[PDB]
Amino acid sequence: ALLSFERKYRVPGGTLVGGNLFDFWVGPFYVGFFGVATFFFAALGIILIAWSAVLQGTWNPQLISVYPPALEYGLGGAPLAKGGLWQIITICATGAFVSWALREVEICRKLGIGYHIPFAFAFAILAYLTLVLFRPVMMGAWGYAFPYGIWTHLDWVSNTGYTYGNFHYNPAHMIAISFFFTNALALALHGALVLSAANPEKGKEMRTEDHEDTFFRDLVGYSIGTLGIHRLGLLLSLSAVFFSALCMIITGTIWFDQWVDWWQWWVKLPWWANIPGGING
Amino acid sequence: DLASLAIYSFWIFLAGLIYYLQTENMREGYPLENEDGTPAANQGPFPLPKPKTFILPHGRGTLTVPGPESEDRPIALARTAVSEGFPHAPTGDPMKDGVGPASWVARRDLPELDGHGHNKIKPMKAAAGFHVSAGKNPIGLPVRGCDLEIAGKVVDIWVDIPEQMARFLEVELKDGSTRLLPMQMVKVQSNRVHVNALSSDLFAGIPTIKSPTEVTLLEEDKICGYVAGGLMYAAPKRK
Amino acid sequence: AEYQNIFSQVQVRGPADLGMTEDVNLANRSGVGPFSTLLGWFGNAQLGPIYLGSLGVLSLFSGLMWFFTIGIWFWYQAGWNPAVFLRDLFFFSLEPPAPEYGLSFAAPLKEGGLWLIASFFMFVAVWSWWGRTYLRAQALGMGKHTAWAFLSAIWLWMVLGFIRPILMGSWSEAVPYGIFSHLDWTNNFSLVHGNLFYNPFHGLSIAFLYGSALLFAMHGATILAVSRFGGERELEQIADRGTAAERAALFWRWTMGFNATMEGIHRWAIWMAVLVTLTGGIGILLSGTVVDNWYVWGQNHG
Numbered sequence: 001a002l003l004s005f006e007r008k009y010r011v012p013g014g015t016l017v018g019g020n021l022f023d024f025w026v027g028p029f030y031v032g033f034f035g036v037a038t039f040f041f042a043a044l045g046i047i048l049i050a051w052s053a054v055l056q057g058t059w060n061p062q063l064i065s066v067y068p069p070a071l072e073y074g075l076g077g078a079p080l081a082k083g084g085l086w087q088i089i090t091i092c093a094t095g096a097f098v099s100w101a102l103r104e105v106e107i108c109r110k111l112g113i114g115y116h117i118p119f120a121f122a123f124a125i126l127a128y129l130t131l132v133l134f135r136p137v138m139m140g141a142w143g144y145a146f147p148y149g150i151w152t153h154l155d156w157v158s159n160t161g162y163t164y165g166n167f168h169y170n171p172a173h174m175i176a177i178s179f180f181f182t183n184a185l186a187l188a189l190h191g192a193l194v195l196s197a198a199n200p201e202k203g204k205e206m207r208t209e210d211h212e213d214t215f216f217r218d219l220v221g222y223s224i225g226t227l228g229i230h231r232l233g234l235l236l237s238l239s240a241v242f243f244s245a246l247c248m249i250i251t252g253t254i255w256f257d258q259w260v261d262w263w264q265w266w267v268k269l270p271w272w273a274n275i276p277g278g279i280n281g
Numbered sequence: 282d283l284a285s286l287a288i289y290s291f292w293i294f295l296a297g298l299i300y301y302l303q304t305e306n307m308r309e310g311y312p313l314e315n316e317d318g319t320p321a322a323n324q325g326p327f328p329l330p331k332p333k334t335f336i337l338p339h340g341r342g343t344l345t346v347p348g349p350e351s352e353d354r355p356i357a358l359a360r361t362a363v364s365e366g367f368p369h370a371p372t373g374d375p376m377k378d379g380v381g382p383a384s385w386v387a388r389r390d391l392p393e394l395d396g397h398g399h400n401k402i403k404p405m406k407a408a409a410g411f412h413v414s415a416g417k418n419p420i421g422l423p424v425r426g427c428d429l430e431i432a433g434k435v436v437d438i439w440v441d442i443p444e445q446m447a448r449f450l451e452v453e454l455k456d457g458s459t460r461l462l463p464m465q466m467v468k469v470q471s472n473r474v475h476v477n478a479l480s481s482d483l484f485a486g487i488p489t490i491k492s493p494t495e496v497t498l499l500e501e502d503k504i505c506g507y508v509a510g511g512l513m514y515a516a517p518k519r520k
Numbered sequence: 521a522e523y524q525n526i527f528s529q530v531q532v533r534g535p536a537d538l539g540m541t542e543d544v545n546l547a548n549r550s551g552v553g554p555f556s557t558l559l560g561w562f563g564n565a566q567l568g569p570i571y572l573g574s575l576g577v578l579s580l581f582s583g584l585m586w587f588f589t590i591g592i593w594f595w596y597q598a599g600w601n602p603a604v605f606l607r608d609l610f611f612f613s614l615e616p617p618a619p620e621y622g623l624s625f626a627a628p629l630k631e632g633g634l635w636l637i638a639s640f641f642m643f644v645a646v647w648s649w650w651g652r653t654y655l656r657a658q659a660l661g662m663g664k665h666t667a668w669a670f671l672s673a674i675w676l677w678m679v680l681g682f683i684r685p686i687l688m689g690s691w692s693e694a695v696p697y698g699i700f701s702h703l704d705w706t707n708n709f710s711l712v713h714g715n716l717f718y719n720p721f722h723g724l725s726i727a728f729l730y731g732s733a734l735l736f737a738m739h740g741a742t743i744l745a746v747s748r749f750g751g752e753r754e755l756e757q758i759a760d761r762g763t764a765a766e767r768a769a770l771f772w773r774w775t776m777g778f779n780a781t782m783e784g785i786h787r788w789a790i791w792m793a794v795l796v797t798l799t800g801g802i803g804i805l806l807s808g809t810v811v812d813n814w815y816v817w818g819q820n821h822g
């Protein structure tokens with residue numbers, strides 16, 4: 001149940017709430033107050049989803065789906081069978097995630113490390129909260145949120161998308177894709193670099209971080225270095241989810257027309273608006 | 282049809298990949314133990330990988346993992362309960378005994394060498410051509426602890442030569458002796474360098490290096506260990 | 521506010537680094553370029569030296585030819601008018617030869633011949649840069665990981681513009697060169713194959729893309745959190761595990777019940793990323809060759 005080096009780290013302390021009450025492990029898992037909070041919130045949510053499954057008449061996970069209140073109910077409550085089960089599960093999900101982040105902060109404190117991980121997780125929590133809370137509230141109904149089903153949530157993506165034409169043309173959505181594609185380029189490279197250094201040819205000695213920098217300078221005339229590539233990855237990632245949240249918080253609220261047509265601010269600039277030729281004249 | 286063969290094939294590939302990946306990540310720390318250091322009964326479903334051997338550069342030898350796991354040091358901790366899963370209390374001074382957030386591991390007592398074979402981390406005085414090229418130069422600045430007293434003054438920056446990066450500040454105490462603080466644990470301000478982790482009276486306790494122009498991997502681990510452990514243990518002296 | 525280590529507090533410059541020698545022909549390495557104080561707050565300041573052998577220059581010539589061929593066409597469409605060129609920049613497009621010409625090289629330039637020309641150029645550019653990626657590693661004695669990983673990116677590219685156009689018997693199946701037009705193609709593609717959300721490879725590609733942002737967020741943040749024990753010195757932490765590696769492993773074990781090693785996390789990382797374009801290229805390759813409609817296929821898998 002313990003890694004060979006683990007015992008020296010399993011000391012008392014670091015908890016945020018409750019003192020030594022919940023200061024222990026179950027197998028490998030740390031508990032803490034927020035470990036208890038996570039189980040509670042997760043069990044409730046799972047029970048509500050099972051109970052939402054009986055009202056629907058399937059126990060097939062590819063079919064099960066928990067829909068928001070329809071637009072008619074606005075930002076108010078709804079009867080469980082048609083809206084309220086979602087609204088409560090959403091509270092139970094939010095409760096599971098925030099609790100989970102805060103549980104990571106307690107694990108951080110006992111291990112004497114920085115808080116970068118909880119901090120990064122809170123960006124994912126924020127993207128979720130944009131779709132199920134922030135954008136719904138700004139729009140005027142929980143019904144604009146997305147449904148908890150495996151394929152039904154994909155349907156919501158497709159229909160929300162096409163409500164605005166080809167959703168490619170959301171300019172904040174363009175930026176977010178860039179970071180996503182770039183963050184994966186970077187992850188492929190970082191992993192390949194370290195492994196090619198750690199695992200050289202045949203009976204060659206283990207290469208060094210100098211060889212890693214040489215290799216990249218050889219290749220593209222620059223190398224960012226080990227502290228740098230880890231600062232980069234954290235940044236591309238967190239940036240991708242930042243612009244994701246952005247592209248949705250503006251869709252349906254400040255812009256609600258076809259996204260392709262927004263790009264006419266550029267083409268109708270008076271300097272070139274009328275000049276003949278091209279595509280737009 | 283072709284597409285159904287492909288997806289079914291993929292799922293089987295992915296399972297062998299996850300298996301390969303998980304056994305790869307078992308080359309350290311395993312086998313699992315009970316809190317008394319004996320081999321635990323349930324190891325889980327994955328077997329240990331066949332050992333692999335790194336040929337270390339610079340004639341430093343060989344590493345084979347997985348291999349015999351031992352701490353190679355005393356752990357000053359004692360059980361607080363009769364069953365598995367509870368905290369193990371420090372039996373002395375956790376800072377001094379090197380437990381908890383103050384843990385270090387017995388790494389080799391040589392310094393890290395760069396690609397060419399030279400010490401990776403030098404003081405800047407012995408680092409030919411290296412200079413502070415941006416930001417406030419910390420050298421000459423007083424150093425403050427988390428109790429708002431002064432503990433020392435910065436006499437040099439120890440640099441990573443290949444990374445071209447500041448890793449430590451060398452600090453002089455009332456003794457006239459010096460210590461290393463890690464860059465990552467200090468706030469370089471305009472009139473001072475501030476240290477949140479440690480209070481002034483704990484600076485004397487920082488592990489000293491045995492030779493004043495190089496640090497070893499063992500000494501780096503004891504120093505970084507000691508000052509991170511202060512965030513927890515020096516906290517009856519913070520705010 | 522404790523120091524978070526996202527930007528350096530103090531930069532430090534020394535003699536320009538000319539790198540390891542091993543087996544590299546130094547005749548081809550350029551001179552160290554300038555030093556960027558800007559870059560240096562985040563990463564290395566040295567814009568130091570790039571190697572340029574025979575493959576490197578073949579790559580850079582082909583790459584510029586591709587870039588210029590599309591550009592002169594963009595001007596032809598703009599009527600050589602600089603204002604229109606800048607106005608309609610995202611709207612211009614170099615389109616493939618129409619379905620009539622099939623897989624032939626006999627189309628007029630003002631009807632897809634320029635497309636073939638640019639594509640030939642991009643083709644040599646990419647494979648020569650791949651060979652460069654392999655050779656640069658062998659000179660240094662390092663494993664071929666970066667080359668293998670790059671092959672996976674090449675796979676998707678290879679399928680979108682070459683392999684799948686050939687299995688369909690037409691160059692008109694390939695992607696046009698244009699900002700807005702290559703987007704319209706993408707949207708059109710899903711529509712014509714019965715919605716790609718039903719392609720089980722597309723959804724796997726998505727999981728890996730998402731998982732890459734998850735993993736790198738996890739890893740990057742983890743190395744920063746244990747950079748106070750010299751975590752970023754990953755290769756030495758591989759040969760001689762320190763408390764950085766242990767605390768990192770232990771955070772995750774106490775969170776989710778399992779953990780990686782310092783080497784092992786990079787095996788997770790290369791694969792998560794690699795499987796993005798690997799699964800993606802299979803899902804595109806099958807689209808229109810074997811499956812006409814992913815809705816239909818999904819209804820009765822077969």
Ligand code: BCL
Pocket residue numbers: 168173174175177178179181182185677680695699702703706
């Ligand atoms: C899913 C695969 C689809 C596809 C779907 C999309 C979608 C959807 C989007 C893009 C986007 C992009 N695509 Mg595409 N794209 C495909 C195949 C390609 C290929 C190719 C295979 O050779 C190329 C060269 C491109 C190139 C491009 C860039 C113009 C842009 C950013 C890429 C990036 O972030 O790289 C990261 C790494 C690099 C090293 C970048 C270097 C390449 C240069 C050309 C990028 C310039 C970016 C620019 C400065 C900022 C964005 C544009 C501004 C908002 C105006 N695509 C196929 C057809 N592509 C995004 C876009 O913003 O387009 C307008 C976007 O939303």
Ligand code: BCL
Pocket residue numbers: 046128131146150151153154157722723724726727728730731734
């Ligand atoms: C993110 C922007 C859009 C969206 C667009 C898409 C698109 C587009 C696709 C998915 C796909 C997926 N989505 Mg989605 N999805 C959204 C929000 C979510 C949220 C949420 C915010 O809570 C969840 C839990 C998911 C979860 C999922 C997975 C079922 C699936 C695999 C992706 C993945 O590998 O993640 C990366 C993370 C990891 C690899 C870590 C492991 C995470 C695992 C896989 C989570 C599965 C849990 C799931 C079965 C729910 C269990 C709940 C209770 C425990 C019972 N999506 C919103 C609405 N999603 C893909 C799919 O395959 O469709 C079915 C797909 O094509």
Ligand code: BCL
Pocket residue numbers: 097124125126127128130131157158160161162166167168173176177180241243244245246247248706
């Ligand atoms: C037909 C579809 C439309 C379209 C409509 C939309 C719409 C509408 C949306 C996007 C969104 C996104 N689009 Mg789009 N999009 C299209 C085509 C594309 C293309 C392309 C063509 O190549 C690409 C690459 C993208 C890419 C993207 C991303 C930028 C973004 C999703 C990432 C995200 O938000 O993560 C964010 C991550 C999360 C929310 C996950 C949070 C996870 C939480 C915190 C924890 C889960 C715990 C879990 C339950 C535990 C389970 C595991 C165990 C059981 C414990 N789109 C076309 C034009 N797109 C989405 C977006 O931007 O969201 C803001 C969005 O809603």
Ligand code: BCL
Pocket residue numbers: 157181184642645646673674676677680705706707708709710715716717721722725726729796797799800801803804
């Ligand atoms: C309306 C749009 C359709 C749709 C149609 C498509 C199509 C069509 C495709 C994808 C593909 C992808 N889509 Mg989709 N997609 C939709 C909705 C989504 C959503 C969502 C709504 O949330 C998401 C998250 C995604 C996500 C994704 C990615 C997982 C995947 C591309 C991976 C990649 O990294 O390519 C980026 C990488 C590359 C293109 C390879 C680049 C390699 C080359 C060698 C690099 C360029 C070199 C060159 C010489 C230039 C260098 C110089 C520079 C110019 C400076 N799609 C809907 C259903 N999607 C692709 C796929 O994989 O299908 C399964 C695909 O082709």
Ligand SMILES: CC[C@H]1c2cc3[nH]c4c(c3C)C(=O)[C@H](C(=O)OC)c4c3nc(cc4[nH]c(cc(n2)[C@@H]1C)c(C(C)=O)c4C)[C@@H](C)[C@@H]3CCC(=O)OC/C=C(\C)CCC[C@H](C)CCC[C@H](C)CCCC(C)C
Pocket residue numbers: 038041042043045046089092093096097100104117118120121122123124147148149150153237238241730731732733734735737738741775776
């Ligand atoms: C910066 C954002 C990026 C990122 C980072 C990130 N995610 C993280 C972290 C970080 C830094 C962690 O520390 C944490 C982690 O522990 O990883 C292993 C985590 C995590 N990211 C996860 C998933 C995840 N992250 C995602 C995305 C992203 N995470 C981005 C790429 C996605 C996407 C792309 O969709 C998913 C699916 C988890 C593995 C984990 C958090 C686990 C957790 O919060 O546990 C508490 C909750 C439960 C045990 C279950 C609660 C269940 C609910 C009560 C009911 C179900 C509600 C739900 C809405 C159902 C919806 C299902 C349908 C949509 C199919």
Ligand SMILES: CC[C@H]1c2cc3[nH]c4c(c3C)C(=O)[C@H](C(=O)OC)c4c3nc(cc4[nH]c(cc(n2)[C@@H]1C)c(C(C)=O)c4C)[C@@H](C)[C@@H]3CCC(=O)OC/C=C(\C)CCC[C@H](C)CCC[C@H](C)CCCC(C)C
Pocket residue numbers: 181182183184185186188189220579580582583584587645646647649650653666667669670672673793794795796797
């Ligand atoms: C698993 C796939 C993922 C990935 C991985 C990946 N890509 C890779 C690699 C890997 C592992 C490499 O090793 C290789 C690389 O070289 O990395 C730096 C590469 C690479 N991925 C690239 C791009 C790229 N990869 C992409 C995607 C992906 N790559 C995925 C995220 C995309 C997308 C998102 O579409 C892009 C845009 C290149 C940077 C590089 C390969 C470069 C190449 O082959 O081109 C040859 C050379 C030229 C075309 C030169 C001409 C360039 C310009 C047209 C002219 C301008 C430059 C000129 C020098 C003048 C400058 C003047 C300025 C004022 C403009």
Ligand SMILES: COC(C)(C)C/C=C/C(C)=C/C=C/C(C)=C/C=C/C(C)=C\C=C\C=C(C)\C=C\C=C(/C)CC/C=C(\C)CCC=C(C)C
Pocket residue numbers: 587588590591592594636639640642643677678679680681682683695696697698699702
């Ligand atoms: C400023 O003024 C100048 C002069 C600089 C000109 C300006 C340049 C401009 C405006 C350049 C703009 C170019 C753009 C925006 C290009 C955009 C491309 C995009 C967005 C996507 C690219 C996708 C294309 C792919 C997937 C192509 C794949 C190609 C292959 C797989 C190879 C295909 C090869 C063919 C068919 C030939 C085969 C031949 C043989 C003999 C093997």
Ligand SMILES: CCCCCCCCCCCC[N+](C)(C)[O-]
Pocket residue numbers: 026027028776777778
């Ligand atoms: C989704 C992957 C979860 C991996 C967690 C693996 C933990 C295994 C712990 C087994 C020992 C027993 N336990 C849970 C009773 O304490």
Ligand SMILES: CCCCCCCCCCCC[N+](C)(C)[O-]
Pocket residue numbers: 293294296297298301
């Ligand atoms: C279970 C049947 C076998 C399925 C295929 C398994 C694929 C394993 C992928 C990892 C191989 C790794 N490698 C090349 C480093 O050895």
Ligand SMILES: CCCCCCCCCCCC[N+](C)(C)[O-]
Pocket residue numbers: 028299303324325326327777778
């Ligand atoms: C995408 C997630 C894949 C998870 C694969 C399964 C990981 C569980 C492995 C547990 C091994 C460890 N343990 C606790 C027994 O030591």
Ligand SMILES: CCCCCCCCCCCC[N+](C)(C)[O-]
Pocket residue numbers: 665668669671672675790794798
């Ligand atoms: C269809 C072509 C796909 C090419 C994929 C090549 C696999 C490379 C996998 C990453 C490098 C792996 N490693 C360490 C096992 O060698």
Ligand SMILES: [Fe+3]
Pocket residue numbers: 190194230739743754786
């Ligand atoms: Fe790393």
